[PDB]
């Protein structure tokens, strides 16, 4: 039944952008009279470059351009139509609602999630979404938000960053949140943003552009977050929890064997009763509660992911709009999308049932894509 579904694809909707425009501290959005697109500024490392451009506009324009590729639904549909994608499960891009004040967060999350539902309603059958949660608000407010979003048309899950309520995903206070999401039968899509402390990349990292934080920081962040969840016993505590991991689990398929060896050889864990004979291994969790996207750019990585979770638990994605062509027309086909489709072909063969599964039928099944 080969339909192509993209489960890793992002937007900033109008209500979100307008909210950021009203902000006076990071993250926030400024519209310069020189440029046709607003500027998104997240890190305080470039709020300074704003002041330069605000006074001496000869300086480089700060932050990221809030392009049509992030903000325009028509642009999203164009991307889909020109890259052979039938269905997208769209999600709010980083940094989501993580930075919002507790009192304002639930109301803003409501408006933004409402707008996502309405965007999906413009192209019935071709658009679904993962909702973001107001995780800076009290847990009761978070649980109320979950019960709300599960009743929004076209919502098929939750997108979650690695910070949780502020102390990461092994925070015990998140257990009722995971239970609420799991009982609502909402898939959790875990996505990176915070990366690693920039010092790890050394004094020359800027010479390499964004390669180190994007190529290494993001997948390593995802790995650490899920490893923490696993070690805390979250998957054992919430057995109906299902997680989709960005970028083929970051590095989890490659390090799963090492994680297992380190656990069974850890003196502290063994001697305090944390390594019982009946323990569910990370391999078991990878087959039973984890889905992996196929945003890995190589048959080498993809084969490791398939070996870890199985071909029925891998899902195609593009990470649109984060990797546009630098020299070819951005309104033409994107090689960053094509790279992963090619990885799928080389890994399991073109026209195979496994290819059809990874390219969309797994997503159709798991997310009940009407």
Scan residues 91-120 and list those touching its own copies (CB under 8 A).
none
C-alpha to C-alpha distance for 253 and 272, rounded to whole angstroms: 28
Nearest to 174 by CA among 219, 228, 108, 104: 228
Smallest distance, its own copies to C-beta of residue 309, A: 10
Give yes or no for a contact between 311 and 354, defined as CB atoms under 8 angstroms apart. yes
Spell out the residues 6+ positions from residue 39 whose beta carbon is closer than 8 angstroms to its own: 29, 30, 31, 32, 50, 61, 62, 63, 64, 65, 66
- Contact segment (CB under 8 A) with its own copies among 91-99, 133-141, 142-150, 203-211 equals 203-211
List residues bridging with 158 in a β-sheet.
Answer: 131, 188
C-alpha to C-alpha distance for 350 and 47, rounded to whole angstroms: 48
Count of helices and strands (H, E) across the chain: 17, 11
> By C-beta, is 165 or 214 nearer to Zn ion?
214
Partner in contact with 297, chosen from Zn ion, its own copies, none, beta carbon below 5 to 8 Å by kind: its own copies
Nearest to 314 by CA among 257, 352, 273: 352
Interface residues with Zn ion (CB under 5 A)?
191
Interface with its own copies includes 38 (CB under 8 A)?
no
User: Which DSSP state fits 6?
Assistant: E
Scan residues 205-244 and list those touching its own copies (CB under 8 A).
205, 207-212, 214-216, 219-220, 223-224, 227-228, 231-232
Position closest to Zn ion via CB: 191
C-alpha to C-alpha distance for 246 and 248, rounded to whole angstroms: 6
Smallest distance, its own copies to C-beta of residue 359, A: 18
> By C-beta, is 191 or 306 nearer to Zn ion?
191
Smallest distance, its own copies to C-beta of residue 256, A: 6
Answer for which of 57, 102, 125, 257 binds its own copies (CB under 8 A) is 257
* Residue 27 CA to its chain's centroid (Å): 18
Name the one residue in this structure whose structure tokens are 């009192």.
103
Q: 3-class SS at 96?
A: coil
Answer for which of 104, 170, 183, 312 binds its own copies (CB under 8 A) is 170
Scan residues 180-199 and list those touching its own copies (CB under 8 A).
196-197, 199
> By C-beta, is 190 or 238 nearer to Zn ion?
190
Smallest distance, Zn ion to C-beta of residue 320, A: 9
Give yes or no for a contact between 238 and 230, defined as CB atoms under 8 angstroms apart. no
- Contact segment (CB under 8 A) with its own copies among 9-17, 135-143, 269-277, 361-369 equals 269-277
C-alpha to C-alpha distance for 157 and 149, rounded to whole angstroms: 9
Smallest distance, its own copies to C-beta of residue 60, A: 11
C-alpha to C-alpha distance for 88 and 363, rounded to whole angstroms: 10
Smallest distance, its own copies to C-beta of residue 168, A: 4
> By C-beta, is 95 or 157 nearer to its own copies?
95
Smallest distance, Zn ion to C-beta of residue 246, A: 6
* Site track 271-290 with its own copies (rule: CB under 8 A), x = hit: x--x----------------
Does residue 195 come out as left (phi exceeding 0), alpha (psi in the -120 to 50 range) or beta? left
> By C-beta, is 48 or 215 nearer to Zn ion?
215
* Site track 298-317 with its own copies (rule: CB under 8 A), x = hit: xxxx-xx--xx---------
- Contact segment (CB under 8 A) with its own copies among 118-126, 235-243, 248-256, 361-369 equals 248-256
Smallest distance, Zn ion to C-beta of residue 124, A: 26
- Do the bridges between strand 243-245 and strand 187-190 make them parallel or antiparallel, or are there none, so unpaired? parallel
Smallest distance, its own copies to C-beta of residue 148, A: 29
């Amino acid at each position: 039944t080969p339909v192509v579904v993209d489960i890793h694809t992002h937007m900033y909707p109008p209500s979100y952008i307008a909210m950021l425009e009203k902000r006076q501290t990071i993250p926030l959005v400024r519209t310069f009279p020189q440029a046709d697109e607003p500027r998104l500024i997240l890190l305080s490392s470039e709020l300074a470059a704003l002041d330069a451009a605000l006074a001496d506009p000869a300086a480089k324009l700060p932050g990221r351009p809030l392009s049509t590729h992030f903000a325009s639904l028509a642009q999203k549909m164009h991307f889909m139509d020109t890259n052979g994608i039938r269905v997208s499960v769209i999600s709010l891009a980083n940094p989501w609602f993580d930075f919002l004040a507790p009192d304002e967060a639930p109301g803003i999350a409501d408006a933004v999630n409402a707008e996502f539902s309405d965007m999906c309603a413009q192209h019935v059958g071709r658009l679904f979404f993962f909702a973001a949660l107001p995780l800076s608000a009290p847990v009761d407010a978070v649980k109320a938000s979950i019960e709300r979003v599960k009743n929004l048309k076209y919502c098929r899950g939750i997108i979650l960053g690695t910070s949780g309520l502020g102390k990461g995903l092994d925070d015990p206070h998140l257990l009722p949140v995971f239970e609420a999401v799991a009982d609502a039968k909402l898939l959790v899509f875990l996505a990176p943003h915070y990366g690693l402390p920039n010092e790890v990349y050394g004094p020359r990292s800027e010479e390499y552009g964004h390669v180190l934080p994007l190529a290494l920081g993001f997948p390593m962040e995802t790995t650490i977050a899920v490893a923490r969840m696993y070690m805390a016993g979250v998957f054992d505590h919430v057995r109906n929890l299902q997680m989709l991991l960005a970028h083929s689990g970051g590095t989890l398929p490659f390090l799963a064997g090492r994680i297992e060896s380190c656990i069974v050889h850890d003196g502290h864990l063994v001697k305090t009763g944390k390594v019982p004979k009946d323990r569910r291994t990370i391999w078991t969790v990878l087959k039973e509660q984890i889905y992996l996207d196929a945003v890995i750019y190589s048959e080498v990585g993809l084969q490791a992911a398939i070996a870890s979770s199985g071909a029925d638990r891998l899902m195609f994605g593009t990470d649109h709009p984060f990797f546009p062509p630098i020299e070819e027309d951005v309104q033409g086909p994107w090689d960053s999308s094509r790279l992963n489709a090619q990885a799928v072909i080389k890994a399991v063969g073109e026209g195979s049932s496994d290819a059809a599964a990874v390219m969309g039928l797994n997503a159709v099944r798991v997310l009940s894509l009407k």
